[PDB]
Amino acid sequence: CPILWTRNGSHCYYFSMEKKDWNSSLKFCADKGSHLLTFPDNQGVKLFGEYLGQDFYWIGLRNIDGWRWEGGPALSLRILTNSLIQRCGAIHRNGLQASSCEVALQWICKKVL
């Protein structure tokens, strides 16, 4: 995969350096023929955490009527939440965490192959 993207077997990931709000992050991944990182089987979050310094990264997870993976099922994992108005999901070394969608954060894109 291209420069700035890193490979893990069959998976190609983009751990952004810049920060964007949730919607712009979703759009950046699509525009690059990829998608915001998801764990649709609700597995692998703890493991993946070993790749995340100390910052939070936007992932394809949102709460519109309960937490859901973008294009996937309902979240079955814990997500630490500070306030009820935090409706978009992020990941960091200690697990999943909610944040207001307008907040600029780094994001992670994923593409297969």
Partner 1 sequence: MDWVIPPISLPENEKGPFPKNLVQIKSNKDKEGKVFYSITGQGADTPPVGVFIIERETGWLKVTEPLDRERIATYTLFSHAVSSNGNAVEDPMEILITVTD
CA distance 51 to 49: 5
Residue 86 binding result from a second copy, partner 1, none, given CB thresholds of 5 to 8 Å by partner type: partner 1
Q: Where are the alpha helices (DSSP H) in 1-113?
A: 22-31, 45-48
Cβ-Cβ contacts under 8 Å for 18 (sequence gap 6 or more): 106
Q: Provide the minimum distance between the beta carbon of 6 and a second copy in the complex, in angstroms, as a whole number.
A: 5
105 binds, among a second copy, partner 1, none (CB under 5 to 8 A by kind): partner 1
From partner 1, a second copy, none, which one binds at residue 7 (CB under 5 to 8 Å depending on kind)?
a second copy
Site string for partner 1, 68-97 (x = CB under 8 A): ------------xxxxxxx---x-x-x--x
Could you tell me how far CA 48 lies from the centroid of its own chain?
11
Q: Are 52 and 70 in contact (CB under 8 A)?
A: no
Residue 53 as a binder of a second copy (CB under 8 A): the answer is yes
> Is the CB of 8 or the CB of 100 nearer to partner 1?
100
What lies within 8 Å, CB to CB, of 55 at 6+ separation is: 92, 105, 106
- What does the binding site for a second copy look like in residue numbers (CB under 8 A)? 1, 3-8, 13, 15-18, 51-55
